[PDB]
Amino acid sequence: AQTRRTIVAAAAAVFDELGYEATTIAEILKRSGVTKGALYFHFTSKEQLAQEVLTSQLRLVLQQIIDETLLLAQLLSKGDPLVRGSVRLTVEPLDRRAPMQEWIGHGRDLLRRAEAGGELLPRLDVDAVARMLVGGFTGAQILSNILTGHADLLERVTDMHRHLMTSVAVPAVLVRLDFSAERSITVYDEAM
Amino acid sequence: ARQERAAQTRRTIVAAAAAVFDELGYEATTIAEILKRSGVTKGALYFHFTSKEQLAQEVLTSQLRLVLQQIIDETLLLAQLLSKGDPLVRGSVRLTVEPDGLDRRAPMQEWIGHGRDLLRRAEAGGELLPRLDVDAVARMLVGGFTGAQILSNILTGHADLLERVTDMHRHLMTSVAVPAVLVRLDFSAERSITVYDEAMRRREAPLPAAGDLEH
């Protein structure tokens, strides 16, 4: 039985529900419905639980970028506890640095590959751009939440991404990228 | 003037309030704490604010040639101030971000309204690429700042803030402005420093009016 699955989906839901701080291993157990000992060779402290939550979910390679971005929006917009938990921990006022750097690094690795394929406009700081993509996502995601409770998330995230790519992708490539809901739902139905 | 004396006490209330929110966030900030730090009476703070919520909202909204240079100015300015630890900006940024029943929606509608309004003005003046949804553009801009701000804090401690805001904003504007206008805009730290020096001058620390001090 893979019940380390079961744990983290309670860990996340709870972290999502209260903060890092008001979350207790005790509440995790009570919710995971799992064993006291089970938890402990798996993860040590509450700290480790959170870290798992932050980094977990984390042709044309620019399409992959898009696809991962829209995937986040999808899970997020449908209360995927895993993702909501990582979003709640990412933001609120625990080491936040190391999961964010790995998030950005994931972006840098994908841009590097697209560079080597000629997909990007010359002179781009591949580090700076990775940071914009994650930020653009993070900003739209917060606003959409405040302004409409995530109802417009998809649209807002897509907007933000589409608009940014205009200065990142070479024309011949920009016009071939697919930001459609059709695709994005396909990619989501995929990873379940 | 009864009126000028009142207006000064109110600045003091808003600034003490931004500092305390910055520090403990919304739920945990009491009025009692703000009174203690501003040194003003209950009566004065009650005369100026309906409630703790309204005062949080006042903190959230207190910051409100080529019109698009106006949007740039305002944007780089927030980042300068935030980078300088200016308490007003510190407080709005903390109040925005956290998840206590304070409506953050209305004040955010106002920020977004603001960008929308100046965008209508840019458009009428032929500065925009055609057929943009202005409301969606205002939403990207504010989102871009918020997003850049959050990351910059997590990753450096607002060290790189002014860089990262300017990047996000340059990219964003390149997809919004007509290119003849994009060449005439000024994303330089140079302009941004000038603007900030000007502003720091309008905003010396408020002291309250004597008639509203706690005794």
Automatic annotation (TrEMBL), chain B:
Q: Which GO terms describe its molecular function?
A: DNA-binding transcription factor activity; transcription cis-regulatory region binding
* Any Pfam family the entry gives: TetR_C_45
Give the highest taxon in the source lineage: Bacteria
What residues are annotated to bind DNA? 30-49
Occurrences of domain HTH tetR-type (ranges)? 7-64
Q: Cite the PROSITE patterns for this sequence.
A: HTH_TETR_1, HTH_TETR_2
Task: List keywords of the entry alphabetically.
Answer: DNA-binding, Receptor, Transcription, Transcription regulation
Q: What is this protein called?
A: Gamma-butyrolactone receptor protein TylP
- What organism is listed for this UniProt entry? Streptomyces fradiae
Q: What is the lineage of its organism?
A: Bacteria, Bacillati, Actinomycetota, Actinomycetes, Kitasatosporales
Q: Which gene encodes it?
A: tylP
